[PDB]
Enzyme design. Structure first.
Site, mmCIF file in Angstrom:
data_model
loop_
_atom_site.group_PDB
_atom_site.id
_atom_site.type_symbol
_atom_site.label_atom_id
_atom_site.label_comp_id
_atom_site.label_asym_id
_atom_site.label_seq_id
_atom_site.Cartn_x
_atom_site.Cartn_y
_atom_site.Cartn_z
ATOM 1 C CE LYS A 1 -2.608 1.412 3.662
ATOM 2 N NZ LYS A 1 -3.670 1.122 4.672
ATOM 3 C CG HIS B 1 -5.423 1.257 10.692
ATOM 4 N ND1 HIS B 1 -5.324 2.026 11.812
ATOM 5 C CD2 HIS B 1 -4.686 1.903 9.705
ATOM 6 C CE1 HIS B 1 -4.608 3.126 11.537
ATOM 7 N NE2 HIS B 1 -4.191 3.052 10.261
ATOM 8 C CG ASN C 1 -3.420 9.050 4.930
ATOM 9 O OD1 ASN C 1 -2.599 8.610 4.139
ATOM 10 N ND2 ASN C 1 -3.728 8.442 6.074
ATOM 11 C CG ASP D 1 -6.661 1.416 14.953
ATOM 12 O OD1 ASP D 1 -6.837 1.396 16.198
ATOM 13 O OD2 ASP D 1 -5.564 1.708 14.403
ATOM 14 C CE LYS E 1 0.048 5.615 5.219
ATOM 15 N NZ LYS E 1 -1.223 4.800 5.028
ATOM 16 C CD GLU F 1 -7.108 4.425 8.095
ATOM 17 O OE1 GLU F 1 -6.031 5.007 8.183
ATOM 18 O OE2 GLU F 1 -7.465 3.783 7.084
ATOM 19 C CG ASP G 1 -4.380 5.576 3.283
ATOM 20 O OD1 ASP G 1 -5.324 6.379 3.299
ATOM 21 O OD2 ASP G 1 -3.898 5.102 4.332
ATOM 22 C CD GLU H 1 -6.500 2.740 4.002
ATOM 23 O OE1 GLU H 1 -6.007 1.805 3.351
ATOM 24 O OE2 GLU H 1 -6.087 3.063 5.131
ATOM 25 C CD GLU I 1 -1.873 -0.594 7.683
ATOM 26 O OE1 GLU I 1 -2.612 -0.426 8.670
ATOM 27 O OE2 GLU I 1 -1.456 0.335 6.939
HETATM 28 O O1 LIG Z 1 -1.908 6.319 7.645
HETATM 29 C C1 LIG Z 1 -2.200 5.605 8.617
HETATM 30 O O2 LIG Z 1 -2.877 4.626 8.749
HETATM 31 C C2 LIG Z 1 -1.596 6.046 9.987
HETATM 32 O O3 LIG Z 1 -2.437 5.736 11.100
HETATM 33 C C3 LIG Z 1 -1.461 7.477 10.010
HETATM 34 F F1 LIG Z 1 -1.121 7.910 11.251
HETATM 35 F F2 LIG Z 1 -0.493 7.909 9.135
HETATM 36 F F3 LIG Z 1 -2.613 8.012 9.646
HETATM 37 C C4 LIG Z 1 -0.082 5.605 10.149
HETATM 38 F F4 LIG Z 1 0.788 6.576 10.440
HETATM 39 F F5 LIG Z 1 0.132 4.793 11.121
HETATM 40 F F6 LIG Z 1 0.351 5.083 9.014
HETATM 41 MG MG LIG Z 2 -4.970 4.571 6.204
#
Ligand SMILES: O=C(O)C(O)(C(F)(F)F)C(F)(F)F
Ligand SMILES: [Mg+2]
Ligand SMILES: O=C(O)C(O)(C(F)(F)F)C(F)(F)F
Ligand SMILES: O=C(O)C(O)(C(F)(F)F)C(F)(F)F
Ligand SMILES: O=C(O)C(O)(C(F)(F)F)C(F)(F)F
Ligand SMILES: [Mg+2]
Ligand SMILES: [Mg+2]
Ligand SMILES: [Mg+2]
Lengths: 357, 357, 357, 357
Positions: free
Chosen positions: C162, C295, C195, C268, C164, C245, C193, C219, C315
């Site tokens: 994965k 997560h 975010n 999570d 971001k 998550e 992802d 995601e 994950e």
């Molecule tokens: O991206 C995600 O899943 C996280 O929780 C974050 F904090 F970045 F949002 C991490 F950091 F753990 F990867």
């Molecule tokens: Mg995420």
């Protein structure tokens, strides 16, 4: 503590370099009502109204003049003034020209309140000034003029332009959009506006063709009040449907968003109910997850967008430039709020006399 | 121009005249975090937070202290600050204690902005000060004490009281309400609060019985996050279900109103997101047609309700009276905003030392 | 019969080889609270919390320390402990940091219960251990580093990675995804992802482009709490929208699934409410037909996924590896539960001292 | 063949026998615009508009005067004229005062078309004249005057009256209704009008009380644009909620009926869009199964209701009696259409001069 002490209105018909052609008629000159709101603090609030057609111009001015009686000697408290006007016009219908006039009062009252506190409006609303991306708004111009205007906008640093479409044939809409794309290149926004000119099936057909060209949004494809028809059109599209310039008050926005009419919104500072209405509209766009742009009124919209959680684009269509000093500037295509109290509208007093009606 | 220069917090556990007994437990004293927000203009913004249980008190203070570095040197622009905090806490979860901490910053920043402009917060928001009807908020007191407290409130000029119910038997709820009604007469509000203590079928049965007694509203009959369950309860009632004190941000309010959870709302100035969140909440309650009251935070809620289109009641429950000067007064049961800049909170500095955790 | 006899917490800021860059900020070091739950059986339950940002780290530790008073001398019965904590925090708000702390207790209580019965947690939950496919979770890495990390993951035997995304331009998102595809080949998963970084229209546009590249899921394309916005995005996609998550408790999962926010879920272990919350979440994912991944928390998630009827992916993002022995292993990219009682977390006591805060 | 040749308007403020007191204010005299539409056939169409408040009166006249150039030389074809005006005002907003002005043109054009064909409007529409039951429409009169007026109406042969309510206390509403009921007996209609004065919970409580008294309908309990709120009120009632006098065009009616706002409708001949809009409204009310009454405009409403499939009541509230000959008569409480071409409006030319603004 601060009271409204006078209301002055001036009807003008002002020059535009480029008449606003649309699929449903030409706006060849801008009919505006210019508003001065005197106060017991000495400062004068400024705003203006757009009457759309000179047929409505004298009526709008007269309505505002008669409305003066309701607001003079009231405190300069725009939220309370708005509630009072909503109640006063409960029976007549707090919409259309009446609502537009109420909004002109509201925009001038907030400008005056900014001046009372010697602070730009954006700061009085609790936000920092930030530059906001702007698109240059054009009209139903044909290929030659659309290309010329698009090259000019790109030279001026705008990153997006809007054109008005709704020619007799879809192939004509496509030709104009495709020509603009040659003028501006690939990394550049092209918004399109149908100005209510299609029925639902024609809008689905035309919009699916335009979506293949990569336009940024499709604005008011059908009759403005038909929120269900806009939802049916949006249901057939990946590109977002944009609307909202014709919402009279946040209550009309709420009805449209409740049924999924559009994926983008663009309230008009006048029709939505001025600053008071805009702030309420902003709270709705935030909850419904709708990026929110402005329609006209670039001077105040630069402030309002800076306080808007889902702020998207500012429409640059300079209807009042012949009569308002150019204190709003553009840097890299972003509108930059001037460091002036309230909205930053300074009349061109010598020019206004040329256009009075 | 005006920057934040520092943040100070003080955690106190303060005495209340009467311990707040509820069906799900007792709040015997009030755990508060008192917030001072220093600015480059020389003014200091004041607000406070309620931690509900001393178990959360040191955690809430620690979180605010660790947030100081995020806000120091930022402009005193609460709307922009709120957006920044929402983004910084996007991953951690902008809700619960984090969101409460952000709201305490917001309330202090708005108080400071009012002071920068030497104007009461209500006027900064664009509204006139107006007296706001208040109800005196009591607890799970039993028949004798509930009735005594209601008589005292009526003698002080309050026109409604709230009692907390959810005794082991429905007949005990009814005995309390009936005793109050006999003592205060038919022209008097009696609100009742179940503090989330009933399952949905119990809430339907108890509520339909209380409705036959004539209560003003039925507050949080079931688990606060169960919006659908509140809707099912409301569907069985003529009397309005009231909720909202537990909404963390206007996004939670929007979810509850979207499904018809309640016919009245009462956001908590802290949980809803401070002044910034309250103003957004007020826009939502206006469109959904929901009369909006306050929860706690009487000092700032008097200002906020004056700017709220559907303002209903102010809750009088003086949690911070031991440490805040009594500048907010009540005349004929209506809260009267003091003539002071910002919110009108002045610390009782000699008293705070007594209660430090 | 078995009682909780102590709670110890340690706040650490731990090293990650590769800082977790995201579209909304960098997580450059992992702030964790390590939890030891002593019992009258002598065994000690272990778990940990992730605080996301060091701003929240001391607050979370303090909250847990203060929560100790509620659980010491209670029976080691996690389901009953959870109900007690939900009631105790009914008024404060059983969400955010409070809920996270409650979940840390729950995860340690179940680890201890596994140890009481000398059995791995998966077996105490009534399931057999099975290997569960895992993806290697990377960050907002740019083309060079994304390629390097993807080659490494494929060499280690992972079948999916994965990354971001949410760079300023869609073309940048596409470049990274396309580069990873060259590194890993065609029969290999690429999850992406965002975010929470896009609005709804941008998410529709970007996701439809990514879907043409064959990504495995998209995601959290928009704000986590906006379940309706996620449904609108999912409505325009064949690829599944993944989220979860950020659900605090199964009640938030229920709300999201009730409105069709997503076609995949990934709770999570901390935010969903620990083991107790995870099992409830698993029952919901089963009925709503939603494949369920984890997560973070890879150590306990290997057990929990083995008991989850719709188990999908684990994950692999090894936040606590610097302070927990590597008893969880990977064979052919599948996580393999260790033959240890409870969760199988053994602290690296010599290492923990380096990172204490 | 027949063309429009000119438009004349006259603004008057005319005396009423009784000032119309409402819960939201008093209409003490009637501000009207009287319209004459000249044609190439020699006949002159007559209609009028109600401006509600003198504040809108000069604005409405000015707007009509400026619309003269749009309609002069156009054929006397009201359906085609209406389409033309809808298109010309598409941008300005075809609602509020603009839509009212278009409706006054429509009503005058239909009157003229009836005169061109020497036939009453009802027959031109394809229906037979028939007497239509009328109720006598009163105001917020207090117990003594309400009861006196109801007795007088019963003596004149009316079989129902409407009173305006929304006194400060519910007991005052009930006292008025009860006093009327005692004076007129059980076989008599008592309609009640709240004139938008209540919030939704207040409307539920007051309405359920009035329902126990036996009223005929409950009209506009809340803000007129709040269709959802009217639906919520109607959902709590056996008695029918009545609304519609404030619908601007049949498109607003369609929105309100689509969501179940009311079980009765009463369009206003002006606001609904004149004869053309009324006929469209009548088609909608037939399909939605809603009995349809009139609001004001008794002279033309007698014709229109005769062509309305679900015709219910005619409202007798003689706003223009000072300036229009009493050709419409009442026999046994039923309105009787005069045997005259068009609508049967004849000006009292000697009287109009008294009242000119
Ligand atoms: O991206 C995600 O899943 C996280 O929780 C974050 F904090 F970045 F949002 C991490 F950091 F753990 F990867
Ligand atoms: Mg995420
Ligand atoms: O009450 C009504 O129906 C009115 O429209 C009013 F103006 F009062 F609102 C009228 F004219 F009929 F009286
Ligand atoms: O009952 C309420 O409203 C409370 O929040 C409580 F804490 F008790 F839950 C308070 F503080 F007002 F008492
Ligand atoms: O198109 C628009 O937005 C307009 O408002 C119009 F009037 F044309 F509808 C204009 F003119 F200002 F551009
Ligand atoms: Mg447009
Ligand atoms: Mg409560
Ligand atoms: Mg009426």
């Amino acid at each position: 503590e601060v009271l409204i002490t006078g209301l002055r209105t001036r009807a003008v018909n002002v020059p535009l370099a480029y008449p606003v052609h649309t699929a449903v008629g030409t706006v060849g000159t801008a009919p505006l009502v210019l508003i001065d709101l005197a106060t017991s603090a000495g400062v004068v609030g400024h705003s203006y109204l757009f009457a759309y057609t000179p047929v409505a111009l004298k009526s709008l001015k007269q309505l505002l003049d008669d409305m003066a009686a309701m607001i003079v000697n009231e405190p300069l408290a725009p939220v309370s003034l708005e509630a009072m006007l909503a109640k006063r016009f409960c029976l007549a219908g707090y919409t259309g020209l009446i609502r537009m006039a109420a909004a002109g009062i509201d925009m001038a009252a907030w400008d005056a309140l900014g001046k009372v506190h010697e602070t730009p409006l954006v700061k009085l609303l609790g936000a920092n000034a930030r530059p906001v991306q702007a698109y240059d708004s054009h009209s139903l111009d044909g290929v030659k003029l659309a290309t010329e205007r698009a090259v000019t906008a790109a030279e001026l640093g705008f990153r997006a332009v809007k054109t008005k479409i709704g020619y007799p044939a879809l192939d004509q809409d496509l030709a104009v959009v495709r020509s603009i794309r040659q003028a501006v290149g690939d990394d550049f926004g092209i918004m399109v506006d149908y100005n209510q000119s299609l029925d639902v099936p024609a809008a689905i057909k035309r919009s699916q063709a335009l979506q293949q060209e990569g336009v940024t949004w499709i604005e008011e494809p059908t009759l403005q009040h038909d929120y269900e028809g806009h939802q049916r059109i949006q249901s057939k599209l990946n590109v977002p449907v944009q609307m909202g310039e014709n919402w009279l008050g946040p209550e009309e926005m709420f009805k449209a968003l409740s049924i999924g009419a559009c994926r983008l919104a663009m309230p008009d500072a006048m029709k939505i109910g001025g600053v008071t209405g805009w702030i309420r509209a902003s709270a709705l766009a935030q909850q419904f997850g709708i990026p929110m742009s402005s329609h006209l009124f670039q001077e105040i919209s630069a402030h309002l967008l800076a306080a808007t959680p889902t702020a998207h684009w500012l429409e640059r269509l300079d209807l009042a430039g012949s009569v308002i000093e150019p204190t709003l500037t553009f840097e890299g295509g972003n509108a930059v709020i001037p460091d002036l109290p309230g909205v930053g509208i300074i009349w061109r007093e010598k020019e206004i006399g040329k256009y009075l009606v």
